[PDB]
Each structure stands twice: as structure tokens, then as C-alpha cells.
Design a protein around this ligand. Structure first.
Ligand SMILES: CCCC[C@@H](CN[C@@H](CCCC)C(=O)N[C@@H](CCC(N)=O)C(=O)N[C@@H](CCCNC(N)=[NH2+])C(N)=O)NC(=O)[C@@H](NC(=O)[C@@H](NC(C)=O)[C@@H](C)O)[C@@H](C)CC
Length: 203
């Protein structure tokens, strides 16, 4: 399918025989699913996100059907806020990110989808994250007014400053919208700006 990003990219998956809903997440290295039992052997791991680390169980070589497309790979199980399909399995199903519905750059997901952005006069690197509602930038002295906000994900919540109507050029494509500023470990471009540049998921 071709999937636009006006709403969260939620799909049905089948894993262990069970149907579950999960988010297609270009900003996730790995696939992480809420607590459940998987047939077999696992090992403990820690993984990180916007707001810290959590402990998970790693299962290897697990068959997963994602909207009808077959994958077999690593699934992490633990207290994730949302079930997420990460790049380890998105690559198996042939998923790419495409600008302007395919006329613009194609970005494969073998490595993190990092691109150059321009914001407040400054050039920065940022991750294109289909699993982020909002755009979150590293502490930057933007002039202007703001409101407090808290945003969540793996590890909990962080406090940020919400600025509106901020221009953000992404790989040469102009966007303008809300930007959240705070201590994120990676600059994140979320769906609020990805939609403005005609970014789609395709497989
Ligand atoms: C789970 C919640 C939905 C997915 C998540 C994906 N964001 C990326 C951001 C990249 C990091 C800042 C992510 O967490 N990636 C993880 C996913 C876990 C994974 N293992 O793949 C990752 O790739 N982690 C690497 C990063 C390295 C960690 N550090 C280290 N190894 N030293 C890893 N392998 O652990 N989205 C988010 O966290 C966003 N949350 C949301 O969009 C919504 N919040 C919630 C709770 O649903 C909305 C209501 O705010 C944040 C940014 C706010 C806008």
C-alpha cells in the first residue's frame, strides 16, 4: 500500500497467532510489542526512547505478518506505550519513505532516516519519525513566545516548550508548523511536518 501520515500509520499484525494493532515507525530501530507470551526462548535487553530506558525481552526469528506481508525477525516484548513496527521488520516488507508521493527523494530504512533540516537560521540533522505525532528539536534558543507541554514515549515523559508557526525546511522542502523544544536525544521530524512535504510510506 501507499500510506499517508494525516493519521497515525496503524496497521493490523499477526504474531504468535494473535491479531494486534501496531504503528509503522521509521524512528524505531526495533519492533516492540506490549507484554504477551511468545513461544520460545528470550533474553533481557534495555532499549531507549524520547524519555529514558525500559527493560524488554528479546525474541529472535519470530514470524510476523504485517498487513498481509510476511516477516521473520526480532521482536522485543515489554511495557511499551504503543506497539511499534521498527526498521528491522519494515525493511523485510520493502517499506520506504517517499517525498511528494514518490516524485521526490526515496529513503530506505536499512539505517536511521537522518536528514538535514533548517530551523531558526540553523542547519541540524533530524530523524524522519512516522511514529511521532509532533516535531521535537534539541535545546535551541528560539526567540518568541511558547507554552509548556509534556510529551511521552519509551521511558516516560519529558517537558518541552511549544512554539507555533515555525518554518522548518526539510531536505530542501519548506514546511511551517509547531515545534517542540527540549532535551531529546535525537531531533525528530514528526507527522505534523511530514504531511506538509507529502511524505508517504510505501510497500
Ligand atoms: C513508543 C511511542 C510511539 C513511538 C515513538 C517513536 N520515537 C522514536 C524516537 C527516537 C529516539 C528519540 C523511538 O522511541 N525510537 C526507539 C524505539 C525503540 C527501539 N528499540 O527501536 C529507538 O529506536 N530506540 C533506539 C535508540 C538508542 C537508545 N540509546 C542507546 N542504545 N544508548 C534503541 N535501539 O533503543 N514516538 C514517540 O516517542 C513520540 N510520541 C508520540 O508520538 C505520542 N506518545 C505516545 C506515548 O504515544 C504522542 C501522543 O505524543 C514522541 C517523540 C513525542 C512526539
Amino acid at each position: 500500500p501507499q500510506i499517508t501520515l494525516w493519521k497515525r500509520p496503524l496497521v493490523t499484525i499477526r504474531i504468535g497467532g494473535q491479531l494486534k494493532e501496531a504503528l509503522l515507525d521509521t524512528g524505531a530501530d526495533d519492533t516492540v510489542i506490549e507484554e504477551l507470551n511468545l513461544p520460545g526462548c528470550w533474553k533481557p535487553k534495555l532499549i531507549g526512547g524520547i524519555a529514558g530506558f525500559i527493560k524488554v525481552r528479546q525474541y529472535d526469528q519470530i514470524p510476523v505478518e504485517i498487513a498481509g506481508h510476511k516477516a521473520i525477525g526480532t521482536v522485543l516484548v515489554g511495557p511499551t506505550p504503543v506497539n511499534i513496527i521498527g526498521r528491522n521488520l519494515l525493511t523485510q516488507i520493502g517499506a520506504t519513505l517517499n517525498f511528494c508521493g514518490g516524485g521526490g527523494p526515496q529513503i530506505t530504512l536499512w539505517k536511521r532516516p537522518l536528514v538535514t533540516i533548517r530551523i531558526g537560521g540553523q542547519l541540524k540533522e533530524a530523524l524522519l519519525d512516522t511514529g511521532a505525532d509532533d516535531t521535537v528539536i534539541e535545546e535551541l534558543n528560539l526567540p518568541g513566545c511558547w507554552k509548556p507541554k509534556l510529551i511521552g514515549g519509551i521511558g516516560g515523559f519529558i517537558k518541552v516548550r511549544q512554539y507555533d508557526q515555525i518554518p522548518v525546511e526539510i531536505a530542501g522542502h519548506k514546511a511551517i508548523g509547531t515545534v517542540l523544544v527540549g532535551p531529546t536525544p535525537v531531533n525528530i521530524i514528526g507527522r505534523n511536518l511530514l504531511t506538509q512535504i507529502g511524505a508517504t510510506l510505501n510497500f
